[PDB]
Amino acid sequence: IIGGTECKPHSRPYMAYLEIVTSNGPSKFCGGFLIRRNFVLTAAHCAGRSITVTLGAHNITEEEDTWQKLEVIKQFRHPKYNTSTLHHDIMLLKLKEKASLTLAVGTLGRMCRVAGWGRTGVLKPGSDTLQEVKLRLMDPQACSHFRDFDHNLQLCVGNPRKTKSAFKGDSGGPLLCAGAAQGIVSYGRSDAKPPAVFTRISHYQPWINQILQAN
Ligand SMILES: *[C@@H]1O[C@H](CO)[C@@H](O[C@@H]2O[C@H](CO)[C@@H](O[C@@H]3O[C@H](CO[C@H]4O[C@H](CO)[C@@H](O)[C@H](O)[C@@H]4O)[C@@H](O)[C@H](O)[C@@H]3O)[C@H](O)[C@H]2NC(C)=O)[C@H](O)[C@H]1NC(C)=O
Numbered sequence: 001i002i003g004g005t006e007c008k009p010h011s012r013p014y015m016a017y018l019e020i021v022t023s024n025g026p027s028k029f030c031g032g033f034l035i036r037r038n039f040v041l042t043a044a045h046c047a048g049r050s051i052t053v054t055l056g057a058h059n060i061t062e063e064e065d066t067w068q069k070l071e072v073i074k075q076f077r078h079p080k081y082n083t084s085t086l087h088h089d090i091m092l093l094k095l096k097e098k099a100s101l102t103l104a105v106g107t108l109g110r111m112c113r114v115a116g117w118g119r120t121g122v123l124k125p126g127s128d129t130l131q132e133v134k135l136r137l138m139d140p141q142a143c144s145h146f147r148d149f150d151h152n153l154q155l156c157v158g159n160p161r162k163t164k165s166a167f168k169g170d171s172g173g174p175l176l177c178a179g180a181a182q183g184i185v186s187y188g189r190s191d192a193k194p195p196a197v198f199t200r201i202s203h204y205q206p207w208i209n210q211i212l213q214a215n
């Protein structure tokens with residue numbers, strides 16, 4: 001998160017920190033959010049050979065009693081997900097058991113908010129602490145330069161006149177508008193110039209329901 005503020009610890013109790021394993025590279029990291037006690041919603045580009053979720057985290061470097069580290073048994077990447085265009089950049093992770101409900105862990109033109117542990121600048125490392133930023137929802141024309149952006153599938157997020165932005169490491173995290181999840185962090189420019197592209201959750205709600213009911 002570029003240009004944001006440190007979250008009040010545990011104030012976003014649905015946030016999930018994902019550590020993703022690849023067979024031929026070191027670990028990668030993404031965000032996500034708990035939508036049922038045994039399901040996390042994230043971006044399809046955060047798929048890997050295996051994933052661990054950490055719920056209850058603020059400072060991700062320091063283990064505390066709020067932490068619940070949970071195994072993912074199965075990854076449900078959207079069947080139409082496209083690795084080039086990042087169309088249908090959405091994925092459900094089924095956890096091995098249901099999370100415990102605690103104060104720190106629970107399920108979940110206008111201004112919206114996004115949180116994550118991603119980098120705080122192009123050249124900066126990932127944040128130790130959960131950060132949050134308020135971003136403007138833009139008209140789709142603002143995202144035209146992303147040649148494969150589609151207004152029906154995706155939100156266009158972040159006033160280009162501000163530096164404020166989600167960035168590397170924030171992928172998979174939710175965008176909340178009036179407290180309801182409306183987007184998933186998907187992609188943007190390497191130079192962090194807003195706006196960025198988010199998955200439009202509303203479009204995928206039938207598919208979300210289909211996975212949950214079968215699992
Ligand atoms: C992920 O999305 C990719 C981008 O849309 C998919 O690649 C596209 O797949 C379609 C088939 O579904 C191909 O459609 C064909 O296009 C040719 C014309 O190709 C030439 O012209 C375009 C520019 O107009 C250029 O981009 C191409 O490279 C070629 O020079 C038609 O003659 C065919 O009838 C048909 O419509 C696209 O060409 C193709 N685009 C690219 C850039 O590869 C990809 O298949 C998706 N992957 C998955 C697994 O879903």
Ligand SMILES: Cn1c(=O)oc2cc(-n3cc(C(=O)O)c(=O)n([C@@H]4CCc5c4cccc5C(F)(F)F)c3=O)ccc21
Nearest residue numbers: 084085086146166167168170185186187188189190196
């Ligand atoms: C499909 N697509 C597209 O049209 O433009 C594309 C950009 C990329 N692409 C490339 C990067 C690079 O080259 O280093 C790069 O760093 N990032 C990071 C990763 C997440 C992110 C980046 C930058 C700005 C904002 C965000 C986000 F968090 F808001 F999503 C990136 O998304 C990934 C596919 C696309």
Ligand SMILES: *[C@@H]1O[C@H](CO)[C@@H](O[C@@H]2O[C@H](CO)[C@@H](O)[C@H](O)[C@H]2NC(C)=O)[C@H](O)[C@H]1NC(C)=O
Nearest residue numbers: 006009058059060061062063064127128129130
């Ligand atoms: C997050 O937790 C880590 C681990 O406790 C903190 O890291 C320490 O930071 C101080 C300086 O601020 C260093 O001198 C220590 O060596 C660090 N310890 C380790 C083991 O890395 C970090 O400050 C915390 N971050 C916050 C709260 O922003």
Ligand SMILES: [Zn+2]
Nearest residue numbers: 009058064066
């Ligand atoms: Zn705590």
